[PDB]
Design a protein around this ligand. Structure first.
Ligand code: HEC
Ligand code: HEC
Ligand SMILES: [Cu+2]
Ligand SMILES: [Cu+2]
Ligand code: NA
Ligand code: NA
Lengths: 105, 125, 147, 382, 125, 382, 105, 147
């Protein structure tokens, strides 16, 4: 695969250490649409509003199968560690208009 | 009762269409086919995604965001049908549209509609 | 007078690193003393402000600060809560954040920072009543930003 | 908007907990429920839906009058329930384009608690008999290891399905007989056109051994399509259009014809009383009692609903009671426990009325049971 | 009307369940989904075999044998349902049994039930 | 049971005719009928059946108020009708085990007279958007050679199906826009999230050319999921929740925005009148008239049925009439001939009420139209 | 393969050639259950009652596929020319109890 | 007296060809005069009638006239409708039908014909009420045949 999952289920945002790579979700959008990280970094998405959101990578992007991430409720987080360089696009399952990408270098 | 009259929520019977958490439900109440207010019936698949709506709770005067997830992989239950549209928006604003079959994320890729649950996912405005 | 600290390590901001030019303006004096940025929603300033934001911030934050390489700056959510205030916002520009967001004293005078901030506050897309950095006269005259 | 008193109490208790949970600070965490363990009061209601392409089965808790689950089915499926509650199954039929295209007959076995399918066994050459749902046209052997289904065309035959091995075995050539009443892992009886009963003993291979009993009913005496059969007691209760009841005891492995009994009294028959409905008979094993849906009606209106149920001692034929159901009932059945429930299903109301079998009093009801619910099935546990 | 009362045939409306030729029909009247008293609706398949019944015609006082053939390959029409059993016999006497889906002989081996026609195939007793 | 004042008429005619055939000794010789030639008065009623796994469409002769045919369908199918009556089709969905198992999305084309399927085109990877039925979520191009359907997840797109060649062609990546209004063999418009209209010109291959129009409505003005579109006239009639009407002229190949018009009067909006239902708008090409289902209701009851229909000049916005439908109507439409019929469908009554569009008088009706009929489709012939 | 159908559909009994081999159908049965004919003979079934009937030979008897003859109304016939020698069993589709046999010698 | 005609071509049967033995019996005289066959359901006759049918007819018509190589004779249906009466049945045997069912005036006496006929009526399986060839008293004692 192109990434590993630290936590299969969402976890409390408060557990995200200061200084960690974070993409906040609020107002129906990924606050950082074009995130640039290095091979090996772990990205953590934190939903900041009541509206549930998740990250969804279609099949073939992070691996054979698509990665339909779990829905984060307010103050919940989800992480993904990228093990290979490249550009991986994603969107929010119920809100296709919500799109973002992670550039692994 | 009058179908066109303003919606009047109650907090004493979840199988009635005027139960407060169903302010924007479309389909059938899961509690009527083996599920519960917030759980899917045996044999069905629980969707992760859904449309939402802010529902007013007459008991505590607070408004809560309800995530209308569907239980799928079964033909419509046919029991306890309801259709409310408090704050429901057209399809070009999917996050609040309820004609959409919210089965995405369900196990086994089940996409058939069986019933809808009314769990609270947070407080609203 | 408000306290100016680096938003990450909390050390005091060293104004000695500031450009010698543009520290004297009445805006800077007033801001440093009260923590108020008089350029907010100031029409005479908005044009230069937008240009200042264009050359220095749009590259990482987007044409309308909706976000890009860096997080969006146009809504109610802030990674660093203090940025909801102008003393905080300024502290972020002056001292920098983490990652690619470094200090800005080597690219903007003190006055230019306040003008740039004026534009960031201008791109705000929330309801006027939420702009805690704005004053009534400014609020009533303020309208959620739209390209 | 119409709720029954039972579902209203449930709906209220549910609201109560949800309100208190919220107030106590609990959070909603949706999951997939499991139905409660099957018990004596558990009852199944199948909806052939007036021969629609798709059908539904409702799993119900008779004690509470609550729908605890459902199971989807194809065209006119035949439901079966293991008496020991270890599993449930049915023989179904589907098409590649709703009601047109390639046909596929198959048998599905389900977990009684998760309702998940534990087996999907395809039947070769669409052999199922497509007809109004008759409980005994698809039957389970006493050991629950085999499912037997009837085939009408092109020739009378019964299919042997190995549930244990999850595989179709073979078709058994049989005389012109109908229905299947299993008495052993390799033996079952059928009712023949000539008025006799046929005993069919089959092995893993070879021609099945078939023998006939004496003709037990005249040619002008019509035995309904829905007789009651208690596999545990080996009792076959077969009513006629007039309410006359033929009881056959198979417990010994061979048919033993008991004294004929009259479900209706001389007075009633003289006043136009006759049985009528779909599942017209019910038989309680432990109490050894017979239940029959009856009413006053013309002789050729035998499939219309009835508003009365008479109970009689199956041994003496003695009248024990006569209940005014208060509704148009098409089918009845009873739970096999000590103080049994009397289930009365109305096809027209799409409602299951649950009564106390002793007093006949209506205890609760469950509505919205599909488009035309017709078959009630229960498990004889213990 | 009384469902248990003796059947009273009429000869003035074929879409009513008391039309004389429907004395032993089970299902739906084809005339209500695009067919006619004796023809199948477009798109359906016409069975050759069927169950029969002797129906009394109040118009001429004669009894005719009706061959209840089914139109198949379609889901139940759901229009004009009727169920009569004049002379209807149990399944072990199939020639007169009407719970059976009489679709045998239909083109394309269609076996799904859509509706029933009521053609006369001869005079009866 | 019940027979419409037009059903009895047909039932008597058939009785009278058959009685005559019998009397004359003319033997019954059953055959498969063909439907009458599609005409201006032919109307289609699709029954989504409250999202059941299987559905039905009823072909109706609006003039006689008679059902002349039917067509089966799967889960939430999208129907289309060739304006020249040469054919009809739909995008459907079926599963291997009723509502579970492998999913298959496909397009079927039907002969309008025999109702026989002339094509079964499979859509790769189940791309259909499963949602309540919106006529314009699946559309035919002007030449009737291509069918376009919308895909919602995992990303907005529209599938191109070649009916002439009977094959799926490709999926088109589109912006976050919804609905499909074809204006040419290679062009169609869409409504976007930002309130603009999107123009999509697509070739046989390569990235489609996409352009946006100006934003024609404010963010807080909500446009219903059932706008009326006349492909022949190139007129798009899009109402808001308040009855405000946005008209877009697409004839020139480019969007031309007409003056907005208010379907409800100031007095009415003041008294709480608002449009409501499913297919809330109809548009007659030749007469250039707009019909809207309205009633007095709270603002968040926009999907409930209405008892009135107001008619107005599309060009001037002048109120021409206001009909009291006498029933709970959920959807309306009109025949496109000289003296059009006004179709009023009630989901609750499962009945189609046929009125005179000029007077608004109810002429006839057709009942027993499925479980929850919702979509009326007509062909603009000539 | 083992027989030919002179007429696809059934025809009037009046058209039946006098002296032809005929099996009458009446009272729910094939009045001549064990017909004996010689190779090349054409047997003709004629229904004599109101109850419709037909002849049905299951797959493998008269050939690869089964022969589900058309239903015969009163006074209607249907013929089959047997080409190979052998015993051919048949029944009435809706009436599986109506059994017949044609011995070709 | 009855009309005795060949059931095929309608010509009068020629009783001159009948064997001389068995033309005198009281049953024959009565029959030729009234068309009534007194041997029907005649206890003292059946046993013999049965033997007659066994050797003379069972081979083609079946052990119980149910049908076999030839057509059934035990029901209400008759290819030659007149056979529902004994005058017609007799005419059939005496003058013959078609194919292998030819005239029997050479093998059976008139009396043997009536006896054999009696067994055929006895093998009837239809309803007694429909046994038009029987008197009321015989109808009252008749029971549909069963092996
Ligand atoms: C790329 C080299 C950048 C340029 C040029 C500018 N910013 Fe930035 N900014 C960048 C990053 C990677 C981040 C995230 C820092 C973190 O620790 O998460 C930021 C963040 C900000 C913030 C904080 C917003 C919040 O949610 O708290 C602000 C207020 C901000 N940036 C302002 C800003 C201005 C005014 C700029 C032009 C002078 C500017 N940034 C340029 C990366 C980059
Ligand atoms: C085989 C050589 C036969 C023997 C021995 C008997 N019968 Fe026969 N019978 C035979 C045939 C092939 C036919 C059909 C003739 C035709 O033209 O259709 C018959 C027919 C009859 C009938 C007519 C019944 C009807 O349907 O009307 C009768 C009454 C009859 N046969 C009587 C009969 C008796 C009494 C016999 C023993 C003395 C007898 N048959 C012998 C062939 C053969
Ligand atoms: Cu989202
Ligand atoms: Cu037959
Ligand atoms: Na932000
Ligand atoms: Na006969």
């Amino acid at each position: 695969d192109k990434a590993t999952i630290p936590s299969e289920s969402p976890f409390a945002a408060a557990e995200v250490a200061d200084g960690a790579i974070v993409v906040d979700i609020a107002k129906m959008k990924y606050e950082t649409p074009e995130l640039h990280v290095k091979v090996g970094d772990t990205v953590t998405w934190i939903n900041r509003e009541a509206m549930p959101h998740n990250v969804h990578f279609v099949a073939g992007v992070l691996g054979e199968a698509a990665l339909k991430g779990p829905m984060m409720k307010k103050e919940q987080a989800y992480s993904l560690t990228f093990t290979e360089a490249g550009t991986y696009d994603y969107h929010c399952t119920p809100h296709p208009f919500m799109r973002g990408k992670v550039v692994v270098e | 009762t009058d179908p066109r009259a303003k919606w009047v929520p109650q907090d004493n019977d979840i199988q009635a269409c005027d139960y407060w958490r169903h302010c924007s439900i479309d389909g059938n109440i899961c509690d009527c086919s083996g599920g519960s207010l917030t759980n899917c019936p045996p044999g069905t698949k629980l969707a992760t995604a859904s449309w939402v709506a802010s529902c007013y709770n007459p008991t505590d005067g607070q408004s809560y965001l309800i995530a209308y997830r569907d239980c799928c992989g079964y033909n419509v239950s046919g029991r306890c049908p309801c259709l409310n549209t408090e704050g429901e928006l057209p399809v070009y604003r999917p996050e609040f549209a309820n004609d959409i079959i919210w089965c995405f994320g369900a196990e086994d890729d089940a996409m058939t509609y069986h019933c809808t649950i009314s769990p609270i996912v947070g407080k609203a405005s | 007078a408000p306290q100016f600290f680096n938003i990450i390590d909390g050390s005091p901001l060293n104004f000695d690193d500031a450009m010698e030019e543009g520290r004297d303006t009445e805006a800077v004096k007033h801001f440093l003393e009260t923590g108020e940025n008089v350029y907010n929603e100031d029409p005479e300033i908005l044009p230069e402000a937008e240009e200042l934001y264009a050359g220095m911030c749009s590259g990482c934050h987007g044409h309308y600060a909706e976000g890009k390489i860096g997080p969006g700056l146009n809504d109610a959510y802030w990674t660093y809560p203090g940025n909801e205030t102008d003393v905080g916002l300024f502290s972020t520009l002056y001292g920098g954040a983490t990652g690619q967001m470094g200090p800005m004293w080597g690219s903007l005078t003190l006055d230019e920072m306040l003008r740039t901030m004026a534009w960031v506050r201008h791109l705000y897309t929330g309801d006027p009543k939420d702009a805690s950095w704005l004053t009534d006269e400014q609020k009533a005259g303020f309208t959620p930003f739209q390209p | 908007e119409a709720e029954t008193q039972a579902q209203e109490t449930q709906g209220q208790a549910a609201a109560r907990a949800a309100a208190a949970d919220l107030a106590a600070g609990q959070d909603d965490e949706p999951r997939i429920l499991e139905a409660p363990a099957p018990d004596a009061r558990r009852v199944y209601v199948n909806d052939p839906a007036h021969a629609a392409a798709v059908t539904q089965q409702f799993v119900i808790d008779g004690e509470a009058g609550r729908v605890i689950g459902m199971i989807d089915g194809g065209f006119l499926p035949n439901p079966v329930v293991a008496d020991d509650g270890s599993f449930i199954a049915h023989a179904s039929t589907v098409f590649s384009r709703i009601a047109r295209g390639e046909r596929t007959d198959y048998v599905e076995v389900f977990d009684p608690v998760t309702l998940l399918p534990t087996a999907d066994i395809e039947l070769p050459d669409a052999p199922r008999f497509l007809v109004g749902t008759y409980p005994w046209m698809t039957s389970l052997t006493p050991d629950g290891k085999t499912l037997l289904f009837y085939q009408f065309s092109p020739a009378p035959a019964v299919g042997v399905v190995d549930l244990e091995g999850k595989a179709f075995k073979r078709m058994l050539d049989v005389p012109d007989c109908y229905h299947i009443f299993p008495t052993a892992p390799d033996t079952f009886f059928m009712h023949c056109r000539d008025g006799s009963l046929a005993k069919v003993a089959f092995g893993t291979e070879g021609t099945p051994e078939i023998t006939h009993t004496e003709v037990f009913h005249p040619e002008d005496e019509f035995l309904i399509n829905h007789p009651a059969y208690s596999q545990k007691a080996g009792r076959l209760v077969w009513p006629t259009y007039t309410g006359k009841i033929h009881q056959i005891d198979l417990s010994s492995g061979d048919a033993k014809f008991l004294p004929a009994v009259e479900a209706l009294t001389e007075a009633e028959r003289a006043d136009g009383w006759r049985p009528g409905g779909w599942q017209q008979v019910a038989y309680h094993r432990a109490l050894d009692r017979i239940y029959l849906l009856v009413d006053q009606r013309d002789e050729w209106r035998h499939k219309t609903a009835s508003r009365f149920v008479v109970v009689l001692d199956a041994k003496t034929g003695e009248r024990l009671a006569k209940f005014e159901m208060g509704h148009e009932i098409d089918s009845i059945n009873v739970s096999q426990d000590e103080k049994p429930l009397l289930y009365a299903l109305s096809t027209g109301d799409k409602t299951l009325y649950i009564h106390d079998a002793e007093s006949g009093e209506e205890l609760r009801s469950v509505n919205q049971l599909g488009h035309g619910p017709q078959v009630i099935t229960t498990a004889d546990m213990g």
